[PDB]
Coordinates of C-alpha atoms (C1' of nucleotides) and ligand atoms in Angstrom, one line a residue:
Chain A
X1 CA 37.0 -89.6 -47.9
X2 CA 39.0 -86.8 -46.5
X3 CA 39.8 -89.3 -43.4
X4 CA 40.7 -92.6 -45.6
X5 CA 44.4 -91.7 -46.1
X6 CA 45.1 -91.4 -43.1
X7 CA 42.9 -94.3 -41.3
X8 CA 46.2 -96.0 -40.6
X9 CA 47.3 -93.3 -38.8
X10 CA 44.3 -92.9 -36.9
X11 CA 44.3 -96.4 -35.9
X12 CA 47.5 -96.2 -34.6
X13 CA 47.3 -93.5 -32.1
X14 CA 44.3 -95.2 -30.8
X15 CA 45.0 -99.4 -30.6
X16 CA 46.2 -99.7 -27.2
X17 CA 44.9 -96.5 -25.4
X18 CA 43.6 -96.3 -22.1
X19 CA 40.7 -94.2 -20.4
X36 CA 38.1 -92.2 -27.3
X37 CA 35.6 -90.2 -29.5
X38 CA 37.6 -86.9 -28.3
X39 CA 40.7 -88.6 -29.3
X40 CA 39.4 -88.7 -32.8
X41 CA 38.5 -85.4 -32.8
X42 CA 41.7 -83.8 -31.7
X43 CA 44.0 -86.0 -34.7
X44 CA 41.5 -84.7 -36.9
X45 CA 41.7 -81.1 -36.1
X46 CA 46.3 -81.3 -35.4
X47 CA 45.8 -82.9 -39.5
X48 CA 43.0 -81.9 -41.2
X49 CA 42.6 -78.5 -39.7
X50 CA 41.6 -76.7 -42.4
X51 CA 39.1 -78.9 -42.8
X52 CA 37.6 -80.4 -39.5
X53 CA 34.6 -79.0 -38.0
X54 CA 32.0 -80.1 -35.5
X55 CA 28.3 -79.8 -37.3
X56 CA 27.2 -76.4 -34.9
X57 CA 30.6 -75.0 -35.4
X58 CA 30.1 -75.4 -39.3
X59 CA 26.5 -73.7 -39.0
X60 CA 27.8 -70.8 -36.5
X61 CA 30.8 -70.6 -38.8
X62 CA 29.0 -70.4 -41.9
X63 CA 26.3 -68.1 -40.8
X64 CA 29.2 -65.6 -39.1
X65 CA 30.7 -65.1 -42.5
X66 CA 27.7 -63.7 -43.7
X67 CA 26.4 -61.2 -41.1
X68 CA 24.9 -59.7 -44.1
X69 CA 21.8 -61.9 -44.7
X70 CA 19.5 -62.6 -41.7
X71 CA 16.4 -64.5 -41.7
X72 CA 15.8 -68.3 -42.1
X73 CA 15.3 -67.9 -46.1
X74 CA 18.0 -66.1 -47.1
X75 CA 20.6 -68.3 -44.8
X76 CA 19.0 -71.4 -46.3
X77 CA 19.8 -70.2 -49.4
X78 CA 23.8 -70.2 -48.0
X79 CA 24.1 -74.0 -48.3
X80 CA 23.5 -73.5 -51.7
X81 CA 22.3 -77.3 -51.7
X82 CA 18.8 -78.6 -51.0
X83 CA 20.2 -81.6 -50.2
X84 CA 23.1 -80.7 -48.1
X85 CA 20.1 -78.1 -46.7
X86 CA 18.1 -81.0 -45.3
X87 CA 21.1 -82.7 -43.9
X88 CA 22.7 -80.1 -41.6
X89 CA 20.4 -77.2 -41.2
X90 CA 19.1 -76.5 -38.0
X91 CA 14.8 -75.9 -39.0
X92 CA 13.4 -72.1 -39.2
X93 CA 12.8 -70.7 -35.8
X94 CA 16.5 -71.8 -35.2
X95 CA 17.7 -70.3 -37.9
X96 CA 15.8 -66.9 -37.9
X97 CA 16.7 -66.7 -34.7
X98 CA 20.7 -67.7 -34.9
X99 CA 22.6 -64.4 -33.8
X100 CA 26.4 -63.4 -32.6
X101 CA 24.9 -63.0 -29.5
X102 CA 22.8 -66.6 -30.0
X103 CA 24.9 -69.3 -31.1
X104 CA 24.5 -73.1 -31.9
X105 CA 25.1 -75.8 -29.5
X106 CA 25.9 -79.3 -29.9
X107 CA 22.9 -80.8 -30.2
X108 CA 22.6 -85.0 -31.0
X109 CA 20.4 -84.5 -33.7
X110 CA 23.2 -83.2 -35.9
X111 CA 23.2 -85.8 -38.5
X112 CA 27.5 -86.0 -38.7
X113 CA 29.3 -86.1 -35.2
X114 CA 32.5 -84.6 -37.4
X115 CA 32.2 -82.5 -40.8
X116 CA 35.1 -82.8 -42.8
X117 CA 34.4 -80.1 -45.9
X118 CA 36.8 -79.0 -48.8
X119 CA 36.2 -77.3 -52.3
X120 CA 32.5 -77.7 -51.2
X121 CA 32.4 -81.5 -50.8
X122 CA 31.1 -82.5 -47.5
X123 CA 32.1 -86.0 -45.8
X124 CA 29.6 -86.2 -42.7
X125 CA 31.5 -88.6 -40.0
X126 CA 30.0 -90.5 -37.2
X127 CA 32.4 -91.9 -34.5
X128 CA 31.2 -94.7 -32.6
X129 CA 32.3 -96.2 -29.8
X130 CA 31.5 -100.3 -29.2
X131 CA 32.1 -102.3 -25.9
X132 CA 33.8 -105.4 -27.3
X133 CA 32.8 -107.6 -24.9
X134 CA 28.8 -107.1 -24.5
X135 CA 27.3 -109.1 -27.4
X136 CA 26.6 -107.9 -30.7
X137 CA 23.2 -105.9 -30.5
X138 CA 23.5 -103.2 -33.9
X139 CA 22.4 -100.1 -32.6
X140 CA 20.0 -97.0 -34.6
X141 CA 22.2 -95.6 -37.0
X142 CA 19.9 -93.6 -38.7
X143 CA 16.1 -93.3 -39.8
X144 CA 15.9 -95.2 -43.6
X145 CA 13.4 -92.8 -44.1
X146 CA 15.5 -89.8 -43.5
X147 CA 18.0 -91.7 -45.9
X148 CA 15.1 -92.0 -48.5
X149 CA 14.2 -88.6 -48.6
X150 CA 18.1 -87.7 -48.7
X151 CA 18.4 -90.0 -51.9
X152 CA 15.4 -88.2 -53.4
X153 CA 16.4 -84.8 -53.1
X154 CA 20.1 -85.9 -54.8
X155 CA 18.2 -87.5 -57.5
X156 CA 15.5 -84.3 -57.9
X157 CA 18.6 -81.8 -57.9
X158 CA 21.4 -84.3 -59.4
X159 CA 23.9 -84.0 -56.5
X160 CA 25.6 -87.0 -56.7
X161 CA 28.9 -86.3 -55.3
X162 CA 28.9 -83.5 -52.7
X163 CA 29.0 -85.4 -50.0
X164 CA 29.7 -89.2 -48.0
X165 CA 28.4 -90.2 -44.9
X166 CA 31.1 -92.4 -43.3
X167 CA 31.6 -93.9 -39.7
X168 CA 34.9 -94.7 -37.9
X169 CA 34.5 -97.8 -35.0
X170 CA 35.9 -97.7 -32.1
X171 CA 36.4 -101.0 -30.2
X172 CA 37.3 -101.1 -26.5
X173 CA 36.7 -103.4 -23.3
X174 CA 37.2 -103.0 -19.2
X175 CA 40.9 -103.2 -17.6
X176 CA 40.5 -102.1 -14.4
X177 CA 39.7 -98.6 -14.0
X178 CA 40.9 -98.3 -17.6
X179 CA 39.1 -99.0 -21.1
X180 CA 41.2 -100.0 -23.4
X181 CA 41.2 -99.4 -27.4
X182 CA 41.4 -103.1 -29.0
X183 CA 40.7 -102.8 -32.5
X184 CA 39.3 -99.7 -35.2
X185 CA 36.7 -100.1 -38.2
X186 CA 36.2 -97.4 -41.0
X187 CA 33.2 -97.8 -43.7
X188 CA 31.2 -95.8 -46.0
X189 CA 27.4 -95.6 -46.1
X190 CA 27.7 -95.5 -50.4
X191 CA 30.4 -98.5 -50.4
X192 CA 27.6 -100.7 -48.9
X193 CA 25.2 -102.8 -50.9
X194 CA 21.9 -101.2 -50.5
X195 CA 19.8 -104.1 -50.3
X196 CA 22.3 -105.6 -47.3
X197 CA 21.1 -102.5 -45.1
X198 CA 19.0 -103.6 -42.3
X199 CA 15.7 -101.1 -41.7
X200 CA 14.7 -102.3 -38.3
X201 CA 11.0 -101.2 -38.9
X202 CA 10.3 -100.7 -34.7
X203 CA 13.1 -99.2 -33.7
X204 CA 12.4 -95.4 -35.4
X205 CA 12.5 -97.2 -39.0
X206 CA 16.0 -97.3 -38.3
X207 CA 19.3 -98.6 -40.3
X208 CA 20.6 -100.6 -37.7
X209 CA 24.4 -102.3 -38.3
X210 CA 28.2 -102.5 -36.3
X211 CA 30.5 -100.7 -38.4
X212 CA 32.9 -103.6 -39.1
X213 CA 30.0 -105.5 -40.6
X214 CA 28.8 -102.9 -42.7
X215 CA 29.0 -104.3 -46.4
X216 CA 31.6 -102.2 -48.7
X217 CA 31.1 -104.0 -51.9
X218 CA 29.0 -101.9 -54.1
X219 CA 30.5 -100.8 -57.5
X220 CA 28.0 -98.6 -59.2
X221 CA 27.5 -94.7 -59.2
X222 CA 26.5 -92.6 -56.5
X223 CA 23.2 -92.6 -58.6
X224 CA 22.6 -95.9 -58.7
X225 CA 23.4 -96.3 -55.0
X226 CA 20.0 -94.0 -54.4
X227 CA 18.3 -95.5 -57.1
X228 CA 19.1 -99.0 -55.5
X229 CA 18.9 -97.6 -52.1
X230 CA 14.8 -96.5 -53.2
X231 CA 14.3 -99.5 -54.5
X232 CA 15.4 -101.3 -51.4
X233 CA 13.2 -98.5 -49.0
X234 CA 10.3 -99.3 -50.5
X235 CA 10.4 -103.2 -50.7
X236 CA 11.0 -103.3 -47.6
X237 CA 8.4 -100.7 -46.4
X238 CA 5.7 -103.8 -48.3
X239 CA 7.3 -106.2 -46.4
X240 CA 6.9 -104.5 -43.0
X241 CA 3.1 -104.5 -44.1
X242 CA 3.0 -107.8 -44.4
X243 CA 4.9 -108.9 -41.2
X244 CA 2.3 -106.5 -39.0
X245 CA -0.2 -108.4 -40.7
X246 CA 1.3 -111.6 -39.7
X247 CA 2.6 -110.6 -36.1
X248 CA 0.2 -108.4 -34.7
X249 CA -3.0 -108.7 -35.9
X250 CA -3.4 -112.7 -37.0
X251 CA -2.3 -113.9 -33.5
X252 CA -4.8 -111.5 -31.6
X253 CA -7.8 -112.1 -33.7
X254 CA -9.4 -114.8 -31.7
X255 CA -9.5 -112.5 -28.8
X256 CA -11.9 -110.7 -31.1
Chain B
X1 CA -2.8 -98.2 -6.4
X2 CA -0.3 -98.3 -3.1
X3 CA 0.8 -94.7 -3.8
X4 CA -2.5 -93.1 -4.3
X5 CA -3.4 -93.1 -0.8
X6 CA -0.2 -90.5 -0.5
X7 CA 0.2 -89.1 -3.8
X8 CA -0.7 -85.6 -2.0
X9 CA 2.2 -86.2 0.1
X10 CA 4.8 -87.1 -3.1
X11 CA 3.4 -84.2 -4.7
X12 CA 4.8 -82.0 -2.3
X13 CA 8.1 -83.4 -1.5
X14 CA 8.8 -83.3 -5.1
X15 CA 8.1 -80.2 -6.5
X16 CA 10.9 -77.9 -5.5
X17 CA 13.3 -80.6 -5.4
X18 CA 16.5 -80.4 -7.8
X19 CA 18.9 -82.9 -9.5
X20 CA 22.2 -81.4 -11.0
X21 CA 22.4 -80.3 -15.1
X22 CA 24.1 -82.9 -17.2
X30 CA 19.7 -90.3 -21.9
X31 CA 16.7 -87.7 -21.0
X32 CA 17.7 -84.7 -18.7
X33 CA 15.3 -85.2 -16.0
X34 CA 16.0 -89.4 -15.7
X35 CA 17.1 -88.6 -12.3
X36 CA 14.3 -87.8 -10.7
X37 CA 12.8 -91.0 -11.1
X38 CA 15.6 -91.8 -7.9
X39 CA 14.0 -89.4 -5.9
X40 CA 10.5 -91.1 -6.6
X41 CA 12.0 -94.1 -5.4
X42 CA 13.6 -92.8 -2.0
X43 CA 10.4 -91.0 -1.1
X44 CA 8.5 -94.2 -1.9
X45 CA 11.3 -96.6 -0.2
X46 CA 10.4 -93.9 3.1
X47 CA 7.2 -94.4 3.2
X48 CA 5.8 -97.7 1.8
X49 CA 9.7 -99.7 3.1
X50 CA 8.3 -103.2 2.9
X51 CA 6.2 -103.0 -0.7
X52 CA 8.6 -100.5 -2.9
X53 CA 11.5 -102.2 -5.2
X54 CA 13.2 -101.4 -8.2
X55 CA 12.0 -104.5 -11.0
X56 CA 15.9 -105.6 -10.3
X57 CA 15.6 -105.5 -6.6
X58 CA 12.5 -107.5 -6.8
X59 CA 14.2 -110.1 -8.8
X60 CA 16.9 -110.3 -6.5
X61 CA 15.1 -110.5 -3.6
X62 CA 12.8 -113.3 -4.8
X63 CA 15.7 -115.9 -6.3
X64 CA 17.2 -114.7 -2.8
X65 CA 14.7 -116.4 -0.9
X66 CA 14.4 -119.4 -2.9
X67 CA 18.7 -121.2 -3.1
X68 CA 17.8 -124.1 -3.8
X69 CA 15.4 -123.3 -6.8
X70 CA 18.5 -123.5 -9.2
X71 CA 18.0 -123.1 -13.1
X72 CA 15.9 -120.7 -15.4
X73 CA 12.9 -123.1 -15.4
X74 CA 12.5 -123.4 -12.1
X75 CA 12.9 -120.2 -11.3
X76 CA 10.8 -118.7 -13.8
X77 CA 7.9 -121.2 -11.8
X78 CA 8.3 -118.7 -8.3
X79 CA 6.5 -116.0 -10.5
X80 CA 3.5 -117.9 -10.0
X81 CA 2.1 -116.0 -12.5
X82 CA 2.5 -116.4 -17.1
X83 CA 1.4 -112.8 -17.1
X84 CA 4.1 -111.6 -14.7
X85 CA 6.9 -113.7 -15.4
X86 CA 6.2 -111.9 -19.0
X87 CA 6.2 -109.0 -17.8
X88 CA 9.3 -108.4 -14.9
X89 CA 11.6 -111.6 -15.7
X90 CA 15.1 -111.5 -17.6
X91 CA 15.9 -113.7 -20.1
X92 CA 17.0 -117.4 -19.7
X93 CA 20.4 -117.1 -20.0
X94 CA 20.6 -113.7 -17.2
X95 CA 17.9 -115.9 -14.8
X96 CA 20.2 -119.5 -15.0
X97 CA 23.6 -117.2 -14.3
X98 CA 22.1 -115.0 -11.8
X99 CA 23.5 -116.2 -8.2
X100 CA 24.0 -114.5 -4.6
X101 CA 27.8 -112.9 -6.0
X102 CA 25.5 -111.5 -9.7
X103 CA 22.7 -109.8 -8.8
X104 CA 20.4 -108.6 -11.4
X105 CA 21.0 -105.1 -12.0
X106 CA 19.4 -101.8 -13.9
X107 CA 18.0 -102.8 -17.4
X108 CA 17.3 -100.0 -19.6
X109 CA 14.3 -102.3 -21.2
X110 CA 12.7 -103.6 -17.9
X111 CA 9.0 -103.0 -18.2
X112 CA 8.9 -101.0 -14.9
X113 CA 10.4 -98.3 -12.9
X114 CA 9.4 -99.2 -9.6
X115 CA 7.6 -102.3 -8.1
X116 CA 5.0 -101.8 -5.6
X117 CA 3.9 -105.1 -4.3
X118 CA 1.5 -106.2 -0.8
X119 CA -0.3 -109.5 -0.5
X120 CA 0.6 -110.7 -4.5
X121 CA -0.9 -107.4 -5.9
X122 CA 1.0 -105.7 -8.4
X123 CA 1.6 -102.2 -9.0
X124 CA 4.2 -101.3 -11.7
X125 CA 5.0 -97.9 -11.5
X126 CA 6.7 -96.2 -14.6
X127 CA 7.9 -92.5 -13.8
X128 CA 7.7 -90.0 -16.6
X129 CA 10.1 -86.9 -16.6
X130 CA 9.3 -83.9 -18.8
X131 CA 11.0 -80.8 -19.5
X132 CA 7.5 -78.3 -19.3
X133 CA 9.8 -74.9 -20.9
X134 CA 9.6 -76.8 -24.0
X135 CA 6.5 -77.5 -26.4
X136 CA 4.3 -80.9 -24.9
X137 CA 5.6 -83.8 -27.3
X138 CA 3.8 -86.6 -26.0
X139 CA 6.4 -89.4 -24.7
X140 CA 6.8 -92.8 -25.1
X141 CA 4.7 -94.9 -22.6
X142 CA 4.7 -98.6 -23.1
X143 CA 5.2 -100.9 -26.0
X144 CA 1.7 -101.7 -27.4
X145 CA 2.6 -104.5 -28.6
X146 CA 4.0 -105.5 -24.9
X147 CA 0.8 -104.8 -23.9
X148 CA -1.2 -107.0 -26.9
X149 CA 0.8 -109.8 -25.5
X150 CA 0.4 -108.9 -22.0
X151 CA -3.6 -108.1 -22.5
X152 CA -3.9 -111.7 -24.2
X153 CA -2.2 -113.6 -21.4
X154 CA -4.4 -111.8 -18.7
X155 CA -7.3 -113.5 -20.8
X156 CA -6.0 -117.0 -21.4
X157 CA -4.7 -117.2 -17.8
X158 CA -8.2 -115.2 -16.2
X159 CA -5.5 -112.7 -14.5
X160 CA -7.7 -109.8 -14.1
X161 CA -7.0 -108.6 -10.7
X162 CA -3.3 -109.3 -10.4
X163 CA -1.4 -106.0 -11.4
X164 CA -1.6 -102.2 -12.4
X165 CA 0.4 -100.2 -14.5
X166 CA 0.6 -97.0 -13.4
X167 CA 2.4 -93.6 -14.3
X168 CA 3.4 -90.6 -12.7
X169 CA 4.7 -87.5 -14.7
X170 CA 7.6 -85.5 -12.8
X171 CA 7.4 -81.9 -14.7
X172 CA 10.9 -79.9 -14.6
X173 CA 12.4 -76.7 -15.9
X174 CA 16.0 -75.4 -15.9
X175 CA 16.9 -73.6 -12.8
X176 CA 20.5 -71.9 -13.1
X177 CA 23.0 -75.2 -12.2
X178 CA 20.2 -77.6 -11.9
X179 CA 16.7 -79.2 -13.0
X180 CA 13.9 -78.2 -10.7
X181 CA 10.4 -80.1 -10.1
X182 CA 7.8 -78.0 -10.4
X183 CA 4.5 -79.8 -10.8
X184 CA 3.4 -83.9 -11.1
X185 CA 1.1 -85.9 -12.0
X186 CA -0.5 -89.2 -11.5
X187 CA -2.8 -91.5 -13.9
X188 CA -3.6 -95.7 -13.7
X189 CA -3.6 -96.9 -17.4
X190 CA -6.2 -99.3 -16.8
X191 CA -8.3 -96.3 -16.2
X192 CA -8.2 -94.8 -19.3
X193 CA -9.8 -95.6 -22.4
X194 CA -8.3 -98.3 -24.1
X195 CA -9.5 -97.7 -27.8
X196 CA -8.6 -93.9 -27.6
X197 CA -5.2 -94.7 -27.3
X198 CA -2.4 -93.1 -29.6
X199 CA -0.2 -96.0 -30.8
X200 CA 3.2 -94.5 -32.3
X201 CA 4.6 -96.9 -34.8
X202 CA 7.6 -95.5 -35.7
X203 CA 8.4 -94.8 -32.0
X204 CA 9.0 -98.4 -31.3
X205 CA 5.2 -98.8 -31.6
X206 CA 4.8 -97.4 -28.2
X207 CA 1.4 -96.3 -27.0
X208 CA 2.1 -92.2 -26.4
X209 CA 0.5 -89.4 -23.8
X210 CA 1.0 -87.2 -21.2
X211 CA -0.1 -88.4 -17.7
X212 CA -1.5 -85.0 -16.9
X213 CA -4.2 -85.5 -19.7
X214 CA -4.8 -88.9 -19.8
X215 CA -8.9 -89.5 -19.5
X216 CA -9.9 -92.0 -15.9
X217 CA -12.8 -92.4 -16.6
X218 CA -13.2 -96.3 -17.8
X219 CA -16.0 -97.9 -16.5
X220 CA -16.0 -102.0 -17.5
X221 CA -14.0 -104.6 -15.6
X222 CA -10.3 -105.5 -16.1
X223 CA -11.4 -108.1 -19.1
X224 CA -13.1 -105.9 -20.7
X225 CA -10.1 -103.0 -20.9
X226 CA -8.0 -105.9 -22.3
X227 CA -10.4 -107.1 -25.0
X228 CA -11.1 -103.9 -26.0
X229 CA -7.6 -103.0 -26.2
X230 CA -6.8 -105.7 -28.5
X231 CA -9.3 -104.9 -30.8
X232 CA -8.3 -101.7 -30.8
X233 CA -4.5 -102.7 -31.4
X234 CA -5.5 -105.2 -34.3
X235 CA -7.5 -102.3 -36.1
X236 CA -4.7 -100.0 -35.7
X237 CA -2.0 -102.6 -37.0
X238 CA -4.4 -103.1 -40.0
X239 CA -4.7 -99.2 -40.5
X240 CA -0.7 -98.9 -40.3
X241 CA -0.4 -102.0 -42.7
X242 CA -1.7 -99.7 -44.9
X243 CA -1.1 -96.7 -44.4
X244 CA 2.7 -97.6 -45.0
X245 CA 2.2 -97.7 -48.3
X246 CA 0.7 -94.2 -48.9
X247 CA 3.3 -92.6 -47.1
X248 CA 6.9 -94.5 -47.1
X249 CA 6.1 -96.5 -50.8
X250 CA 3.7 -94.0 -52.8
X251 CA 6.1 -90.8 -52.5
X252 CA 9.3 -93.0 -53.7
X253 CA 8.2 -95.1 -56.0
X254 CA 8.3 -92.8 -59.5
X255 CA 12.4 -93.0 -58.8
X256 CA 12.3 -96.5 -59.3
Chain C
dG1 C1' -3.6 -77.1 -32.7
dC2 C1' -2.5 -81.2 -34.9
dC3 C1' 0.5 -84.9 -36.0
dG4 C1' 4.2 -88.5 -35.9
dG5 C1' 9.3 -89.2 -36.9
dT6 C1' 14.3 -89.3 -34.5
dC7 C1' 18.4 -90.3 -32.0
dG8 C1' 20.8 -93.2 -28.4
dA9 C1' 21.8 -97.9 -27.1
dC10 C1' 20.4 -102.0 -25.8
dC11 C1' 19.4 -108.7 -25.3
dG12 C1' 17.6 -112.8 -26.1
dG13 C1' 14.3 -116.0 -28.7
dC14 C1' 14.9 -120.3 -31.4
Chain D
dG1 C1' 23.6 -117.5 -37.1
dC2 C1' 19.6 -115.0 -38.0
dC3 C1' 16.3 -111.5 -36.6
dG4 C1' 14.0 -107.6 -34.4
dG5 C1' 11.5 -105.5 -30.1
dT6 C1' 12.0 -101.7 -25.9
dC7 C1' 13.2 -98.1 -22.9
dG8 C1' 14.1 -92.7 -22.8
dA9 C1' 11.7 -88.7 -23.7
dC10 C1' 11.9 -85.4 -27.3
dC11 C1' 10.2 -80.9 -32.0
dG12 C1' 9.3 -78.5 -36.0
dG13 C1' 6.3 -78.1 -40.4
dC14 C1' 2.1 -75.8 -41.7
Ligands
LIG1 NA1 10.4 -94.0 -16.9
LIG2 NA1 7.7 -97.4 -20.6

DNA sequence: GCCGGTCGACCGGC
DNA sequence: GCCGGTCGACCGGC
């Protein structure tokens, strides 16, 4: 991680302030400058250094990636029809809120922000299926280290008109146990998890993270079978 | 339906009506829905909340989550439009029930202990028709098995009506709408999305009205179409999110 | 045309 | 503590 070294830092311009993602945003663009982009400024970027090749093939070919490919790129129309005069705009679905890149390695971060004080309810990270196909492509094409998803916590509550920072969590997706990652089948097949409980105790290879990671997907995907079986079907069969 | 009668009349306040540019972009017109419908039908038009509020209002002395869950007067209902236990024993005169973001319904439309839960549906029309979530259909399993085991067939409605917008400059502009009664359609032709929080999906415009058995039978052969389609998802899991993955492990 | 996955953010049962 | 359902619409591949 291109933010890790300088977590503490982060963490102290932020404990205590009043009213946060912004915040982030701005420390990481005064330090990591050269490095700190926001996922449609990346794309514009990356396209605008190469006003030579146009269409959605030949700029796909620009990530030279397939995985990094699926992870940022915007789909065909979008890309075909991306111009000087058309540009990219934030758009949620950008898988990393923050894109730190340097000598090609890519560390997609997600800020969050958490209301300390509203009961734990872990909210959609992102789709395990997404995450599957992500750890087949870097399997198919070997890419095992260009790139980390990571996510940086921000905790805050209400005083007064003000909301104030209380407490900071970082954590890397890879650092997790696989099998500890919660697929909450209903909501959008979604990894669901607060960032300060996010597991960080894996100690294998980036390889074996998606190997485990599969292995995990797809055990789980049986299970969720089975539990439809059990919860929607079995106690509405006598209505039948 | 209580807004039938005037639907013509909504229809025509709304379209050409405007909300400023900032989930979902067009939320806000679901407020103008309300103030038309507050206008017009004052005494049987409340947001889920208000409804709450007003009941436990009325009733002080009914103190504590299970006896206030009893001035439903109704299992079905009280699944429904209650909050949880917790929210219901808390709730008091100084902490009123407010918006949910998972309350079954949008607006309440309620004369002589008839129902009508009204969901509105916004939709940006100047991009492609993706068919948007509707209602849990597994909320409505549940809900379709306690009309049966309680006989509450002619209690409540859920209805929808579809608020079409476009980008106007500034603001978000109404340009058409649409109105369709769930229990008019046909129960086994609908689209359950499991993935979208297994939410039955369509777009109000093209919803089919043209059921013709009683209330009992929509809900029994809803659940048989539910069960089939949880047997057929059970399944088809396996094809699709075990199959593909599987030669990695 | 057809088809269904995705992100955002939430309570409450036992 | 553990576990997971619900609202909101909303897009892009072929
Ligand atoms: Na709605
Ligand atoms: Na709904």
């Amino acid at each position: 991680s291109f933010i890790k070294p300088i977590y503490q830092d982060i963490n102290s311009i932020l404990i205590g302030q009043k009213v946060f993602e912004k915040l982030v945003y701005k420390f990481l663009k005064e330090n990591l400058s050269d490095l700190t982009f926001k996922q449609y400024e990346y794309l514009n970027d990356l396209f605008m250094k190469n006003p030579a090749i146009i269409g959605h093939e030949a700029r796909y070919k620009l990530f030279n990636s397939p995985t990094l490919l699926f992870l940022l790129s915007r789909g065909k129309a979008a890309t075909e029809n991306w111009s000087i005069e058309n540009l990219f705009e934030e758009k949620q679905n950008d898988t990393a809120d923050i894109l730190l890149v340097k000598d090609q390695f890519y560390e997609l971060l997600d800020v969050k922000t958490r209301n300390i004080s509203k009961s734990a309810f872990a909210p959609n990270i992102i789709s395990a299926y997404k995450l599957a196909q992500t750890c087949a492509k870097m399997i198919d094409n070997k890419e095992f280290d260009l790139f980390d998803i990571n996510y940086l916590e921000v905790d805050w509550e209400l005083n007064g008109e003000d909301l104030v920072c209380v407490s900071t969590s970082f954590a890397e997706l890879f650092k997790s146990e696989p099998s500890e990652l919660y697929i909450n089948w209903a909501a959008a097949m979604q990894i669901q998890f607060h960032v300060r409980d996010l597991d960080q105790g894996f100690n294998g290879t980036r390889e074996e993270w998606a190997k485990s990671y599969l292995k995990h997907f797809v055990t789980q995907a049986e299970q969720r079978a089975i539990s439809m079986i059990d919860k929607f079907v079995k106690p509405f069969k006598k209505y039948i």
